[PDB]
Amino acid sequence: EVQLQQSGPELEKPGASMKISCKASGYSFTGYNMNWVKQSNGKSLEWIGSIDPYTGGSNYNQKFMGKATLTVDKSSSTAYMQLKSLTSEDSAVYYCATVVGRVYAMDYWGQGTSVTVSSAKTTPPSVYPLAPGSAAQTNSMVTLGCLVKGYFPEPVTVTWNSGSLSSGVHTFPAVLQSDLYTLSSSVTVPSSTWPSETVTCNVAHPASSTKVDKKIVP
């Protein structure tokens, strides 16, 4: 089927410029109009500009007038969204679209490019042990945790009990403090099996190559 492959996730410093690209297959790239949208976590999703691949046509939203422009490569069957004067607001996942019968979606949308913009250097996260106060230990199951605080940029992965435990853990949404990212995760395990047993979090973060584990102490 037609499949769209946007660029890999990228991060740039503000007041700068970057170009992303959406790959095309199983369809006449040039014959179906393309489209681009910006994906804001805080706000809904909002269209930037539709693009005509065969003749390199470009329609721009009043919001993105001049901020960004659209290019295309018919031979490589891959469009190019050009971004200039990049700002912290621009930071977002992007998404290419294919217009069929006046409709940009579901067919087709790319996997997504997590465009980010930053003046913060790569940082490894702070990991500390998390768990109970007065009575939650008595429970049949007591949850323990590991912090992923003050790190840059996201992606992150985690393992538990030296990787022996990969289930009952619950990953918690990420939040950004002082410009460095933060996130959490749990380890529901029997309380009858802790501190009686012990666990450490084998956290693997690719961009900052972090491998730091924290033992949980009652």
Per CB under 8 A, residues contacting another protein are 28, 30-33, 35, 44-47, 50, 52-59, 61-62, 95, 99-106, 109-112, 126-136, 139, 143, 145, 147, 149, 170, 172-175, 177, 182-184, 186, 214, 216-218
Residue 182 CB, nearest approach to another protein (Å): 7
- Which residue number, 14 or 154, has a Cβ lying nearer to another protein? 154
* Cβ pair 127, 201 in contact under 8 A: yes
* Cβ pair 1, 109 in contact under 8 A: no
Residue 21 CB, nearest approach to another protein (Å): 17
- Residue 136 has φ and ψ, to the nearest 5°, of -65, -20
Nearest to 99 by CA among 36, 6, 23, 21: 36
Nearest to 33 by CA among 70, 83, 75: 70
Residue 138 CB, nearest approach to another protein (Å): 10
d(CA 65, CA 53): 19
* Cβ pair 131, 215 in contact under 8 A: no
Burial of residue 207 (number of CB atoms within 10 Å: 0-12, 13-18, 19+): middle
Residue 204 CB, nearest approach to another protein (Å): 18
- Which residue number, 32 or 151, has a Cβ lying nearer to another protein? 32
- Which residue number, 14 or 129, has a Cβ lying nearer to another protein? 129
Residue 172 CB, nearest approach to another protein (Å): 6
Please work out, in degrees rounded to the nearest 5, the angle formed at the alpha carbon of residue 112 by the alpha carbons of 108 and 113: 140
- Which residue number, 102 or 211, has a Cβ lying nearer to another protein? 102
The tokens describing 194, both together, are: 């802790």
* Cβ pair 36, 59 in contact under 8 A: no
- Which residue number, 55 or 209, has a Cβ lying nearer to another protein? 55
Residue 13 CB, nearest approach to another protein (Å): 25
- Which residue number, 104 or 160, has a Cβ lying nearer to another protein? 104
Amino acid present at 42: G
